[PDB]
Design a protein around this ligand. Structure first.
Ligand SMILES: CCCCCCCCCCC[C@@H](O)CC(=O)N[C@H]1[C@@H](OP(=O)(O)O)O[C@H](CO)[C@@H](O)[C@@H]1OC(=O)C[C@H](O)CCCCCCCCCCC
Lengths: 171, 171, 171, 171
């Protein structure tokens, strides 16, 4: 209901996203945020991360047959947030119980033995705070690791350990 | 433990800043924002921009003898904001009349004949939105171009025309 | 030696509960039962207790912003049990230590200056025997008063005095 | 450059507190203040009020097995503030979401149909101003009633009505 700008998000067109065919909406405010890792290549420049977002969406859309990249937002090691399905569209990232009731954000990389740099972590958390400001997320949203809702190594041991320390984390 | 503050700002230690010796505090909520360009080299990756921030500060501190880089914040073409003097400390970027009453943000590069990429412009807006949320800048803050308050070409013809289109800009 | 059937419980749909957003599961057989009072208005008819359960849930969901009414079950003075989060879902009634290991049942009304009627006490006892029969509760489950595990007057002096006499109460 | 600022809080030692065993810290400046009532009896002389602080602490530590009395501060009707976990240690007064991000002040008494006397309201307001002066609370901290964040009658209808008029109150 409120107006103002918040965070910086690389818009779909900027990373050359194929148009989205998704139409199923999320009911705001969303209560849950599920953090995953793509378990794909990482990137650390805006040019390489735009390409990585395009690659992940390519895989989801072209190979998995989904209506769009599965994540609502992707986070690059360049410290930028990449617009996925966005705040209003149900994503495909955490199974049928979780997809309809959460926002999925994914760090582009494999964090089993590596951590995302502080800039990626800041972008992620700042994105969530913007979500709250926009009324897209509940002021009391809860952040979970992908492994807290599905059997998976995601978001990677190292990254999971870090999100466990976030303010809104509730396993 | 505790949430990283808004604006996804690269902290001064992250860009290896020399310690500041500045002491003068700004009285918040600050009314003005002055946008400048560094008229120096630009950079388009976190690694090159952290180095550029370091270079700009080195010049101000080592050569000009200042207590810190003069800008409150620097904006890189990597789409990230670099912490300079910050929200609370008076900068040295717009002269004696403006320094005490504004936050000076400087785009790293020379914008006389080229524009900052959208990600750099987005980073600048994210930052200002964050200053308002923080209480650092008043809600109805006013943006001024550096040339509007000191005799200079900064922030560069091309960046100057863009800022003139900002809702908070005031001639 | 095989699964039977108990439970004279009023289904959520019947009391027109808002849908639950809770998903964390309790581990059966649950060892503990925490008895609280809603400290609010009591009701002595199915029509009024269905609305009272709705009001209590409204407070938790609408005002406190929770995923569901915090209790696993609510007990009315009409002698009926109202389905809250139920046997399988972690409630929100006794804090972080006790919620994961207990079923929280709450008597609807204030039992500081009142005892619940015999029919409400029978409802509660019958519910717990049902939980043991279903394997939801350990056969030797321990009953705690809310005030024994959190700082509160709950479940009210009168009710507290009553539960301290129960076979299953464990100081 | 003046050492003494605000304060005049009855130190633990003085109300004869059992040594705290809590070590989890809050991060200053703290954004939220949650006002509760102890829900029991009041005290209106320094002698009585100090006995009560001991009593509340006794319940939390001896009975509930807590590391210290749960509140950061207690307000006596004797017009004095009683030191609890203090400005820096995470309390146990508003649940797992609020505890790590707020300062819990509890008026010693039950204010459902009795309002705290002016000297207790002054004590409380002065402590908060003190908090801000010290950097312990943010200048724009928000006050919430206990019942705004937890299912409880605390801080009492009478005291709740009064705090909703406070400058910093925000439901
Ligand atoms: C610490 C001791 C406090 C003393 C308690 C005194 C007794 C009176 C209150 C009843 C306690 C009961 O609520 C306990 C409870 O259920 N706790 C939290 C939690 O338990 P878990 O086991 O951790 O899941 O279960 C849930 C998960 O984490 C959660 O619901 C519970 O408490 C919370 O964390 C939720 C917050 O209390 C409410 C959050 C939003 C409040 C709405 C305020 C709106 C203002 C807007 C703010 C921007």
């Amino acid at each position: 209901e409120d107006p103002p700008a918040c965070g910086s998000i690389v818009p779909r067109r900027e990373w050359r996203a194929l148009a989205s065919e998704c139409r199923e909406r999320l009911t705001r405010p969303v209560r849950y945020v599920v953090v995953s890792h793509t378990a794909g290549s990482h990137c650390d420049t805006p040019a390489s991360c735009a390409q990585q977002a395009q690659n992940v969406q390519s895989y989801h859309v072209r190979n998995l047959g989904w209506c769009d990249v599965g994540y609502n937002f992707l986070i690059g090691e360049d410290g930028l947030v990449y617009e996925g399905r966005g705040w209003n569209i149900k994503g495909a990232h955490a199974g049928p119980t979780w997809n309809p009731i959460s926002i999925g954000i994914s760090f582009m990389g494999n964090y089993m033995n590596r951590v995302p740099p502080p800039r990626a972590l800041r972008a992620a958390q700042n994105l969530l705070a913007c979500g709250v400001a926009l009324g897209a997320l509940r002021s009391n949203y809860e952040v979970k690791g992908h492994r807290d809702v599905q059997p998976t190594l995601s978001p990677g041991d190292r990254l999971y350990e870090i999100i466990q320390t976030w303010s809104h984390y509730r396993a």
